[PDB]
Homo-oligomer: A and B are copies of this chain.
Amino acid sequence: LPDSILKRGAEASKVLEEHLERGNIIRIISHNDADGLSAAGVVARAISSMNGQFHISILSRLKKEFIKKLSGEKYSLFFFCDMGSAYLEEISRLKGDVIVADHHQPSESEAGPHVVHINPHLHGLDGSRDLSASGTAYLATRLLNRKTAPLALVGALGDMQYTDGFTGANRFIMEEAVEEGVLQVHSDLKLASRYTEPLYRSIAYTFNPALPGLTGDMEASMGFLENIGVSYGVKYPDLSPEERDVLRDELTRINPEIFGEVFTSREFRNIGDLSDIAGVLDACGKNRKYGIGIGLCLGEREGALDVALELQKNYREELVKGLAWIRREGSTTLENLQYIYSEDKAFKGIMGTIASISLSLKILDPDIPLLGLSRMDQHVKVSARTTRPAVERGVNLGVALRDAAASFGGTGGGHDIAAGAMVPYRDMESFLQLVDEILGTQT
């Protein structure tokens, strides 16, 4: 990588150690998706391993008001994951030391001198591809605990940073984790929950890498498996070798991606591969069941796990319906983006995910950035997704949504390839065109 970062990391480990040695409790603030929860987990696990204590809050968006509420509180160290780069001035106004582990672009003023800021953008690395919050937290805790590297990669997968191989600092973290013996790599089919789910359901629930015709369609996948003569009520490992080969052959025909690298760790045995864990965390996060998510990251797997797996199941079911909806009513295309709108509470939480999946499946034109829109009474939650070719063409959704949302007194941001915003429902049209214009621009 560029050895610079590792250094910045170490600065942050030093600070962390200082405060732990003094007995003071560490305040952790993070985001509510796979990356945010796995980042919070990395840090809390590092603290735990030093017989230290931590206080975690999970937020869906960091707000100026919330930062002020903290500036009260008698905590000596604040650790921010997956947010904060946009509020560096405001955060600097905290009494007490601060670490910010984040991977969004600038944001933007200077960052005070009692604050440690780790961000791939600052070290010549791409925050959209080469590192996520969870990995940034690992670099911050790497000299204290290396057992956490699998979780670091959970967040990276969660944030869609696997682009045929891990790249940049994610590659570094993978390599290390192998070297430390806590991560194994296998070539295999990338099917959903292969250890806990019968083949027909596993195929239907393989949303990424997507399998057009089969993904999201229990009937068609059951059918498909009969047509090719492969048992559809057994779990993948309980198949015969011959059946495995025929299956590998026929699914690859539908999408070559389906076969490739698969990541496992003794830590997550009986649950899933690393991508599966990312899914379980997304389901916990979408259900504001943050405790279950973090418990899972720290190693709780008894009642918590049952609950977590049940939440996934529901999550998956909701995704199937959402995909069916998009197939039924289409999207309206403009000139530089397309969009999809729904007042159904069923889809509020999952709009971004079904957006992404629908582009992969090519239900919708993957060349055109897709804005999913869900009403929250007076406001509308926006979830924008596109693809890596579109980012190459110059698309930056994080920028477009931030600028546009501000214009109407809203709040928005993200990365080039995925972003979100919140705006008055009343301003939806105006909003949408403005993004349109902003779009065609950078393009």
Interface residues of A (CB under 8 A from B): 23, 53, 55-58, 69, 72-73, 212, 253, 287-292, 295, 300, 302-304, 306-307, 324, 327-334, 362-368, 389, 393, 443
Contact = CB atoms under 8 A, between A and B. Distances in A.
B362 A331 contact: no
A97 to B, nearest CB: 20
Given A291-B363, A292-B330, 7 more contacts: A53-B212, A55-B366, A57-B365, A58-B365, A72-B393, A291-B330, A303-B329
Contacts of A53: 212
A438 to B, nearest CB: 15
B58 A330 contact: no
A253 B364 CA distance: 48
A212 B300 CA distance: 15
A307 B329 contact: yes
Instruction: Name the residue among A72, A253, A300, A328 with the largest chain B CB count within 10 angstroms.
Output: A328
17 contacts: A53-B212, A55-B365, A56-B365, A57-B368, A69-B393, A73-B389, A288-B333, A289-B330, A290-B330, A290-B333, A291-B331, A291-B363, A292-B330, A295-B330, A300-B327, A303-B324, A304-B328
Nearest to A73: B389
A324 B300 CA distance: 12
A389 B368 CA distance: 43
A347 to B, nearest CB: 15
Contacts of A289: 330-332
A389 B75 CA distance: 13
A310 to B, nearest CB: 10
B302 A55 contact: no
A53 to B, nearest CB: 8
A303 B332 contact: no
A414 B287 CA distance: 30
Contact of A288 (B302, B324, B332): B332
A300 to B, nearest CB: 8
A337 to B, nearest CB: 11
B332 A364 contact: no
Contacts of A287: 332
A292 to B, nearest CB: 4
Contacts of A307: 328-330
A364 B291 contact: yes
Nearest to A287: B332
Instruction: Name the residue among A291, A304, A324, A330 with the largest chain B CB count within 10 angstroms.
Output: A330
Contact of A57 (B69, B300, B328, B367): B367
A333 B333 CA distance: 36
Nearest to A255: B53
Contact of A330 (B253, B304, B331, B334): B304
A23 B303 CA distance: 47
A71 to B, nearest CB: 12
Given A69-B393, A303-B327, A327-B304, A55 B362 contact: yes
A303 B289 CA distance: 34
Contacts of A331: 289, 291
A275 to B, nearest CB: 23
Contact of A303 (B292, B328, B333): B328
Contacts of A393: 69, 72
Contacts of A23: 253
Contacts of A295: 327, 330
Contacts of A364: 291
